[PDB]
Amino acid sequence: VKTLNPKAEVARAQAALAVNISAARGLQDVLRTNLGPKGTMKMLVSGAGDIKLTKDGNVLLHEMQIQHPTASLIAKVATAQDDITGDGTTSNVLIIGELLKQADLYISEGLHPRIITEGFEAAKEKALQFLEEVKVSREMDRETLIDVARTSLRTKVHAELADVLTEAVVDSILAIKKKHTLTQIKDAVRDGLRAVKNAIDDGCVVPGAGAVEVAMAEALIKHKPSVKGRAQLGVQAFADALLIIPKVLAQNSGFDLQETLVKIQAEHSESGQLVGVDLNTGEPMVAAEVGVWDNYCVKKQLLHSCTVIATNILLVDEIMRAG
Amino acid sequence: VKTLNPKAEVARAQAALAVNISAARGLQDVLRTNLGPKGTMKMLVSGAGDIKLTKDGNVLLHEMQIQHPTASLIAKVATAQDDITGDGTTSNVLIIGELLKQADLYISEGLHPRIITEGFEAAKEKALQFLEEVKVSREMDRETLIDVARTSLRTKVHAELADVLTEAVVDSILAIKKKHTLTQIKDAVRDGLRAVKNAIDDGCVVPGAGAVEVAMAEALIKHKPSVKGRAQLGVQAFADALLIIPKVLAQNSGFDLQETLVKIQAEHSESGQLVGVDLNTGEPMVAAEVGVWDNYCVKKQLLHSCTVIATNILLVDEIMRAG
Amino acid sequence: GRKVQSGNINAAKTIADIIRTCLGPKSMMKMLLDPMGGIVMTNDGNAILREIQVQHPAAKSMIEISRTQDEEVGDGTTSVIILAGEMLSVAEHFLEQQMHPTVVISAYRKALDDMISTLKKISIPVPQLVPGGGASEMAVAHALTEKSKAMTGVEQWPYRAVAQALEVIPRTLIQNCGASTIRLLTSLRAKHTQENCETWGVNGETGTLVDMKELGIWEPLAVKLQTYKTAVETAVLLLRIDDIVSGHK
Amino acid sequence: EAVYRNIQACKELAQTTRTAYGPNGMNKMVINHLEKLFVTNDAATILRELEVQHPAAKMIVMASHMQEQEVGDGTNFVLVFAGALLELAEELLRIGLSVSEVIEGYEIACRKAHEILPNLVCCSAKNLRDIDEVSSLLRTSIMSKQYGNEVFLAKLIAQACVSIFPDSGHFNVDNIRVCKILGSGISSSSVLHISTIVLRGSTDNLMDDIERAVDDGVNTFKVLTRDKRLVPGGGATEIELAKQITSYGETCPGLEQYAIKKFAEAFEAIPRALAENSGVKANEVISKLYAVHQEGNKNVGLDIEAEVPAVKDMLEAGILDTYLGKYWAIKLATNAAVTVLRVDQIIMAKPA
Amino acid sequence: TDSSQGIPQLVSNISACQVIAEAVRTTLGPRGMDKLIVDGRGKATISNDGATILKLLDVVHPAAKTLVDIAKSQDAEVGDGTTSVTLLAAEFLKQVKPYVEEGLHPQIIIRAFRTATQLAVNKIKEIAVTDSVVAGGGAIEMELSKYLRDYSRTIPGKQQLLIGAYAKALEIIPRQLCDNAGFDATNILNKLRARHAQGGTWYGVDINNEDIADNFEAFVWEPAMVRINALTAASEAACLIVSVDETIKNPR
Ligand SMILES: Nc1ncnc2c1ncn2[C@@H]1O[C@H](COP(=O)(O)OP(=O)(O)O)[C@@H](O)[C@H]1O
Ligand SMILES: Nc1ncnc2c1ncn2[C@@H]1O[C@H](COP(=O)(O)OP(=O)(O)O)[C@@H](O)[C@H]1O
Ligand SMILES: Nc1ncnc2c1ncn2[C@@H]1O[C@H](COP(=O)(O)OP(=O)(O)O)[C@@H](O)[C@H]1O
Ligand SMILES: Nc1ncnc2c1ncn2[C@@H]1O[C@H](COP(=O)(O)OP(=O)(O)O)[C@@H](O)[C@H]1O
Ligand SMILES: Nc1ncnc2c1ncn2[C@@H]1O[C@H](COP(=O)(O)OP(=O)(O)O)[C@@H](O)[C@H]1O
Ligand SMILES: [Mg+2]
Ligand SMILES: [Mg+2]
Ligand SMILES: [Mg+2]
Ligand SMILES: [Mg+2]
Ligand SMILES: [Mg+2]
């Protein structure tokens, strides 16, 4: 009686949503500490023993031993998605880690994954709209590029090196247009060059410090009633998900990640100006005035990338052993 | 070296919040099916074997083998809390099972229990306000009492018995004012008598079918910004918690408990009239017109009871072995 | 039958269930886990089938049949492993009542000859086209259910079973939109018992019922004929296999 | 997962009785609580010595007792039809409709069946004192219980019931005493005088069966005094009810459709158990019955006599049933099935 | 053993009846092996009679108990033929087990032990000679067998291979009559069958010498009424044990 066994049966309908969501959440909780200034490096010891302080998303996801196959996916798809924008990882992995958690609530409540993702799509459209109406477009004078390079260099090195490299990167691009710590300085300079280049290319320096995450989540919630039926549960999980960046920004600076966010959401609702997270006192601050800028080429792609990856990892029924 | 052991160490800070919340959630998931018409009886076999169809909260919580000590508490405190109001259990246990779940999210996020409960208190005050502004107070003619007795008799027996006992209970109170299925009929008649009595005593027949739960949750959310700081996370967990009664009402009638609730919240926001859950077609319905009424003595106490029990079970640090 | 036409239905059930949801415009990806690293996500039924080692001869035959249909007609290759897992799933309810496989094969092969009579009838010219969505399947199912009211025989229950088995295509086009497969399929049945409502199908992206003469979905009546022929033939090629014995040559 | 353990016990309660339905019903050895072997065919005495303890099954037995005291027959109908109701409900809940959606479907179908029945009656009891009309018409009740000397017991019980009978009704089933003189010779039994049947068996274990058959016999005379309407027995009325209920379900739209069609397919489980207890194939005879009932015979039922699946008219054969005995049977069976369908999560109680 | 319901329960009952007969088989005949059954008092009882072995035997199985009660009932009123009855009953049960392992169903095996038995008692009351006597020592079970199989060959339906197995199940009485004397049964029975095919309706096993002998001339006689009663009682015991579907053991 040869060959009578129906093998290959794993992960039925939720058994795979649960696995993939837990893997995404683990990958989020690994990179959660490295976001923003006042973050935290990682070691990345090789086989020979070459340690490498590597506070960033690209070098980390591209070089660390990621055991879970789903997280290995999310990293192979997230690394290959930050060479068209320069650097927007460590925010992709987190936002995905909330599009997949804020959806687990409704999914466990009995919703179908392909109903949330419709809400994800509508929310992405409204978010791109609100981001195209919030871009502050100004001249790329040496003054502004100083800020757009300092905010992207303090992200990878402390304010000792990130206050002498800003000049060297804003004067190495204004002249072209028309050891375990040398790798770190090299990567930080290549990332400040890419940041100032993306700021020069389009001319939009849309505010940072999580201000646009807060202002993009609250406009969504004000837009939720006008979308559809159960689709609303996709714009209320894409709203509380573009809200960890301020939450984790506050968490990395030793603050309670619910009082600062509440103060920010209140001060944003009072004065109507998009307000961010001050990383020194925890009080809300106007990122446009203080002089912190993101790129309209990095947050325009942080939505596409996060939404695509999250929808794809929500749209899985079985995980089967191939050959 | 006599007596050198520091014994009695269980359940440290979360180890007890987790236990109590899981116990409350289990007690909710046990009584979740028996809410509303089209519910589901339970058996309650004794030692001798006397089966007893017992679809209600009082007889169930007062007579079933509740293993978990915390759930045993919640039942000893919930049974002793529905003799001053007549019958409002099976809604207490559920609402508590969401005040304790919708708070587990924020608590796991790093919040302190005594911050939510402040929000619970403010939300309870606003809910009592909205319930004192929504009470429809009308004459207690035999017509209305027919509805207030039919809606409370269909809750305990099917529409075969609950359409011949309504007359017998509205004509046994309009003349006093100035087997395993006989226990069931007796309890249903005592509960219709208590319902019509509570309707006569105050004169308010505030609508049911979950309409007031929906209208009380949305007024809260419209009141959330004006409360305080992190207290807001107590009026957004007391809002999505006075929202299971419509959810579970829809679930017990074989409907998806997210489409019906969305349709109800949309139709309530359009016409501004408080709208409930039609248990036959799943479409929103005006409980005031269709003729389903709750009591302003049962939902006035459903807030106090649920809030008190939930705040108390959230305010626990240790579970220790006494003597 | 015995434990051989019920061990060939569980292989067919397994193969159908693996790809059942990879159907429609609202497809749902699957994860293929290699030995070393694994995950490669694809919502394409064929690749999923061409990359899982089934090792069972019944499953090996369903995969083989599916590949041949794919390299012959192209479209309608994941609607063949389905309607062959589904038409086998309903066959087992009669092999449990001591009904010889010859009787169900004499019912399947009889339902087919009536299955390809309404596709010829509900088709529209410019060969011809057949209403897409679930309309063609529900129309054929209703036609067979009305033709099975004058059977007066023991091969009458297997006749209706095939009819009600051509509903897994709407049952999945509704399950992938999040809608309730029950409350909507009953409405489809109701719509199809009328006179002219033979083109009412399922909007594969919204999860609502739409007349396919107004949504504009149409499948050529050569990938809906080869699909049904191949399904009801793989359903009578796995039902007449009494023993899986060794072989040396 | 808790409403399926109830159904999976009401099934096993209906399988230890299904096999004792027709005149060709099996005959099992019920060890008594006192260890006294009385192999009996009656399937109401089986429940007495089975003592089913699963509470979900106990409710079907309580409905069976209600049928046993409301009327005197149909005790198997009440727990071979409720078993089919629940077996098909489990076959319908897995589609996912809900407990709630199939209970009301069953209630609608039962209301329908109680309006089809008074249109299925085909005979009556014109004179309840004419002794051949009380023997040949009370035969089926004993024939179903004691195949063999079906007509001798029929006449001997017809004599007793007709003798003690006023001009107005008031038949007392407790009037007819049954002596059990341990003699020899079944034929030697007679009716003395309130009446009494001496019932001379042979071994005081082949007249206890005859005593139960006499019970079922005179119990048919009591119901015949209240309702004269008689319906064709041997699966005829069941197949007709199933056909008409299937038609009604096909017309009616909504989710009740499935439950109504399942209620009809639950009525088909009576002639299925009638034939399966005779050797013939069940599907063959259900098809041969549905195909002759579509033409409009309306009175044809199972032919127990032949070896192969065969159909026979039941009016001209005299194998009838009683209207009330099936009205109450369907009513109590539906009420029992919908009851244990409601019950979910059987909890233990608190020690009083 | 399964012994749950249906085929398993019937096979269990059949095996139990086989055991209870096997405990008496060697006692059949004029000269038969004795049995040494000892009570609880240390008394040694040697008795070559089936009646006095069943009245001194612990019957703790239901089917075996019913068979033993029917055997005792035959012994009480008639006397002769209380081990031939249980032998015929257990053999009727043994020769339908291969047909009850399939789905033949007992209700049909019962309409084969009642038509065939009625026909066999008719044949006895038609062939008996004068008070009426028939030749014992076989010579009936070797004729009723020949008659029943030759009649079953003319039955279209399932009762052909059940009466033909009822007939084959009668050859045990003329078999263990010579299996107890040690006479190489498969030869004496072959001679008896060959001699009953041609003629010799009274030819049965001889016990004085290992050969067939006309048993009517040899004055080894059996009362026709006794044979009819034994056949009917054995067939009714068979039908009883075949008509049993389950064993409802009260929990208490
Ligand atoms: N000096 C700063 N103060 C407040 N927020 C900052 C500052 N610098 C950067 N950020 C914010 O930190 C967020 C995340 O940056 P990070 O994750 O460290 O690198 P990347 O920008 O590549 O994701 C950015 O959105 C930015 O707005
Ligand atoms: N016929 C009905 N239609 C819709 N909703 C109803 C109906 N009857 C009762 N309800 C609702 O069901 C809710 C819960 O009642 P239930 O939990 O069964 O008993 P209790 O009212 O004692 O908690 C009530 O708030 C009521 O508004
Ligand atoms: N927009 C649509 N809405 C509804 N059904 C659709 C739509 N597009 C295709 N379908 C149907 O989906 C079914 C599955 O087709 P598909 O998943 O592409 O695989 P295949 O047709 O090769 O089996 C077909 O019956 C087709 O008619
Ligand atoms: N001679 C017969 N031929 C066919 N069917 C019969 C015959 N006698 C009775 N029946 C049917 O089989 C049933 C057997 O009755 P039984 O199950 O013992 O009683 P009940 O189920 O009413 O307690 C009868 O009610 C009738 O429907
Ligand atoms: N002298 C004999 N020769 C041949 N057969 C005999 C003789 N005596 C008895 N038999 C056979 O032995 C069988 C068994 O009889 P036995 O055991 O003596 O008493 P019982 O008939 O009560 O069992 C009878 O069927 C009879 O035909
Ligand atoms: Mg950066
Ligand atoms: Mg109530
Ligand atoms: Mg296609
Ligand atoms: Mg009866
Ligand atoms: Mg003797």
Where do the structural domains in chain A lie, given as residue ranges?
Answer: 10-138+204-320, 139-203
Supply angle C-alpha B6, B9, B13, rounded to 5.
Answer: 140
Q: Which amino acid is at C41?
A: M
Chain C residue with Cα closest to D293: C152
**Which residues from A are below 8 Å from B230, CB to CB?**
256, 258-259, 262
Supply angle C-alpha D178, D184, D189, rounded to 5.
Answer: 40
Q: From the CA of B46, how many Å to the nearest CA of chain D?
A: 5
CA dist., res. C74 & res. C67, Å (int): 9
C23 CA to middle of ligand 8, Å? 8
Helix (H), strand (E), coil (C) string for D86-111: HHHHHHHHCCCCCHHHHHHHHHHHHH
Task: Using alpha carbons, list the distances in angstroms from residue C146 to C63, D277, E202.
Answer: 33, 33, 69
Dihedrals φ, ψ of C224, to 5°?
A: -95, -15
Q: Strand pairing partners for C40?
A: C32
Note the Cα A104 to chain centre separation in Å: 19
- CATH topology for D3-124+229-348 is GROEL; domain 1 (1.10.560)
In CATH terms, the superfamily for domain B139-203 is TCP-1-like chaperonin intermediate domain (3.30.260.10)
CA dist., res. D196 & res. D179, Å (int): 7
Around ligand 5, the residues with Cβ closer than 6 Å are E 28-30, 50, 80-84, 136-137, 173, 177, 207, 220, 222
Give the residue among B262, B244, B196 at the shortest CA–CA distance from B91: B244
Contacts of E251 (CB under 8 A, 6+ apart): D51, D53
For residue A280, give the ligand nearest its CA: 1
Phi/psi-derived region of residue B8, left when phi > 0, alpha when psi is between -120 and 50, beta in every other case: left
Q: Is A264 helix (H, G, I), strand (E, B) or coil?
A: helix
Is A89 one of the annotated binding-site residues?
yes
Q: CA gyration radius for chain A?
A: 21
| DSSP run (H or E) holding A62 | none
Is C181 one of the annotated binding-site residues?
no
| Mutational test site, ligand 2, from B56, B60, B249, max ligand atoms within 8 Å of CB | B249
Contacts of A161 (CB under 8 A, 6+ apart): A153, A185, A188
- Chain discontinuities in chain E, listed by preceding residue (C to N exceeding 2.5 Å): 130
CB–CB contact D99 B51 (8 Å): no
| DSSP run (H or E) holding E46 | strand E44-46
Supply angle C-alpha A296, A300, A304, rounded to 5.
Answer: 165
CB–CB contact B258 A106 (8 Å): yes
Supply angle C-alpha D302, D83, D4, rounded to 5.
Answer: 150
* Strand-pair category, A316-321 with C29-33: parallel
Task: Considering only the beta carbons, identify the residue of B33, B45, B62 that sits closest to D348.
Answer: B45
b/e string for A32-69 if b means 16 or more Cβ within 10 A?
Answer: bbbbbbebebbebeeeeeeebebbbbbbbbbebebebb
Supply angle C-alpha A280, A281, A283, rounded to 5.
Answer: 125
Neighbours of B128 (CB within 10 A): 16
Chains A and E touch (3+ CB pairs under 8 A): no
E87 CA to middle of ligand 4, Å? 36
Handedness of CA E180, E184, E186, E187 (dihedral sign): negative
Q: Is B163 helix (H, G, I), strand (E, B) or coil?
A: coil
CA dist., res. B303 & res. B305, Å (int): 6
- The residue extents of the domains of chain D are 3-124+229-348, 125-228
CA dist., res. C57 & res. A5, Å (int): 10
CA dist., res. D247 & res. D232, Å (int): 20
Beta strands in E62-173 (DSSP E): 133-135
Give the residue among A264, A321, A248, A256 at the shortest CA–CA distance from A57: A248
Handedness of CA A146, A152, A153, A154 (dihedral sign): positive
b/e string for C162-192 if b means 16 or more Cβ within 10 A?
Answer: bbebbbbbbbbbbbbbbbbbbbbbbbbbebb
Whether E106 and D27 have beta carbons less than 8 Å apart is answered as no
D31 touches chain E (CB under 8 A): yes
CA dist., res. A238 & res. A82, Å (int): 21
Whether C114 and C147 have beta carbons less than 8 Å apart is answered as yes
Give the residue among D125, D109, D107 at the shortest CA–CA distance from D117: D109
Beta strands in C15-101 (DSSP E): 29-33, 40-42
Measured by CA distance, the residue closest to atom 20 of ligand 4 is D74
Look up residue C114 and give its two tokens: 């009536």
Q: From the CA of B118, how many Å to the nearest CA of chain A?
A: 14
Measured by CA distance, the residue closest to atom 2 of ligand 5 is E220
Q: Look-up: residue for tokens 């269909």?
A: B154
Q: How was this structure determined?
A: cryo-EM
Neighbours of B95 (CB within 10 A): 25
How many helices and strands (H and E) does chain C possess? Answer: 13, 7
Neighbours of A292 (CB within 10 A): 26
Note the Cα E88 to chain centre separation in Å: 1
CATH number of D125-228: 3.30.260.10
Q: From the CA of D76, how many Å to the nearest CA of chain E?
A: 16
Give the residue among B19, B136, B133 at the shortest CA–CA distance from B74: B19
Architecture of domain A10-138+204-320: Orthogonal Bundle (1.10)
Note the Cα C177 to chain centre separation in Å: 19
Which 8-state DSSP code applies to residue D219? H
Burial class (CB in 10 A: 0-12, 13-18, 19+), C213: middle
Chains D and C touch (3+ CB pairs under 8 A): yes
Whether A207 and A294 have beta carbons less than 8 Å apart is answered as yes
The helix-helix angle for B259-271 and B244-252 (nearest 10°) equals: 130
Residues C37-44: contacts with CB under 8 Å, at least 24 apart: C37/A69, C37/A72, C38/A69, C38/A72, C38/A322, C39/A69, C39/A70, C39/A72, C39/A73, C39/A319, C40/A322, C41/A73, C41/A312, C41/A316, C43/A315
Burial class (CB in 10 A: 0-12, 13-18, 19+), A141: exposed
Q: Look-up: residue for tokens 């109450």?
A: D328
